[PDB]
Amino acid sequence: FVNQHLCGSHLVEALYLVCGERGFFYTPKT
Amino acid sequence: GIVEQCCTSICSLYQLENYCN
Ligand SMILES: [Mn+2]
Ligand code: NA
């Protein structure tokens, strides 16, 4: 796999693909 | 964290996998 430059909703899409049915947590810094 | 890293730098799919449930 290649490294990634992912901002905004593109990171969410990547997490979805990687994790699949396992689900994931999206937790930006506040 | 990962959200900032992936956007300001780069990140791997292996790093992303740490956020799966
Ligand atoms: Mn875009
Ligand atoms: Na990767």
mmCIF file of C-alpha atoms and ligand atoms in Angstrom:
data_model
loop_
_atom_site.group_PDB
_atom_site.id
_atom_site.type_symbol
_atom_site.label_atom_id
_atom_site.label_comp_id
_atom_site.label_asym_id
_atom_site.label_seq_id
_atom_site.Cartn_x
_atom_site.Cartn_y
_atom_site.Cartn_z
ATOM 1 C CA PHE A 1 0.000 0.000 0.000
ATOM 2 C CA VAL A 2 1.000 3.601 -0.578
ATOM 3 C CA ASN A 3 1.143 6.394 1.923
ATOM 4 C CA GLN A 4 -1.726 8.809 2.055
ATOM 5 C CA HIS A 5 -2.419 12.580 2.179
ATOM 6 C CA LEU A 6 -5.973 12.757 3.489
ATOM 7 C CA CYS A 7 -7.906 15.798 4.655
ATOM 8 C CA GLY A 8 -11.459 16.288 5.734
ATOM 9 C CA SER A 9 -13.995 13.783 4.503
ATOM 10 C CA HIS A 10 -11.320 11.945 2.518
ATOM 11 C CA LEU A 11 -9.869 10.629 5.764
ATOM 12 C CA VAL A 12 -13.314 9.322 6.744
ATOM 13 C CA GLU A 13 -13.600 7.509 3.419
ATOM 14 C CA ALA A 14 -10.197 5.916 3.962
ATOM 15 C CA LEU A 15 -11.113 4.779 7.478
ATOM 16 C CA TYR A 16 -14.304 3.270 6.102
ATOM 17 C CA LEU A 17 -12.405 1.285 3.509
ATOM 18 C CA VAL A 18 -9.661 0.134 5.869
ATOM 19 C CA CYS A 19 -11.952 -0.870 8.703
ATOM 20 C CA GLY A 20 -14.955 -2.243 6.903
ATOM 21 C CA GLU A 21 -17.390 -4.063 9.162
ATOM 22 C CA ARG A 22 -15.102 -3.504 12.149
ATOM 23 C CA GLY A 23 -16.125 0.147 12.207
ATOM 24 C CA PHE A 24 -13.977 2.947 13.397
ATOM 25 C CA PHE A 25 -13.663 6.059 15.505
ATOM 26 C CA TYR A 26 -13.032 9.477 13.954
ATOM 27 C CA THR A 27 -11.479 11.812 16.551
ATOM 28 C CA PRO A 28 -10.042 15.091 15.447
ATOM 29 C CA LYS A 29 -8.198 17.328 17.776
ATOM 30 C CA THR A 30 -10.347 20.062 19.302
ATOM 31 C CA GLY B 1 -3.430 13.085 16.180
ATOM 32 C CA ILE B 2 -4.148 10.908 13.185
ATOM 33 C CA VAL B 3 -6.623 13.333 11.626
ATOM 34 C CA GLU B 4 -4.094 16.151 11.696
ATOM 35 C CA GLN B 5 -1.140 13.955 10.692
ATOM 36 C CA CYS B 6 -2.831 12.575 7.597
ATOM 37 C CA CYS B 7 -3.719 16.095 6.423
ATOM 38 C CA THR B 8 -0.544 18.077 7.265
ATOM 39 C CA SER B 9 1.874 15.288 6.560
ATOM 40 C CA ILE B 10 1.216 11.734 5.334
ATOM 41 C CA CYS B 11 -0.088 8.617 6.964
ATOM 42 C CA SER B 12 -0.266 4.882 6.163
ATOM 43 C CA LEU B 13 -3.228 2.536 5.946
ATOM 44 C CA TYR B 14 -1.530 0.603 8.795
ATOM 45 C CA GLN B 15 -1.648 3.678 10.969
ATOM 46 C CA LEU B 16 -5.322 4.132 10.071
ATOM 47 C CA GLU B 17 -6.078 0.567 11.089
ATOM 48 C CA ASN B 18 -5.345 1.516 14.698
ATOM 49 C CA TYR B 19 -8.659 3.466 14.651
ATOM 50 C CA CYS B 20 -10.812 0.495 13.687
ATOM 51 C CA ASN B 21 -13.105 -0.937 16.348
HETATM 52 MN MN MN C 1 -11.860 16.973 -1.650
HETATM 53 NA NA NA C 2 -0.360 2.631 3.489
#
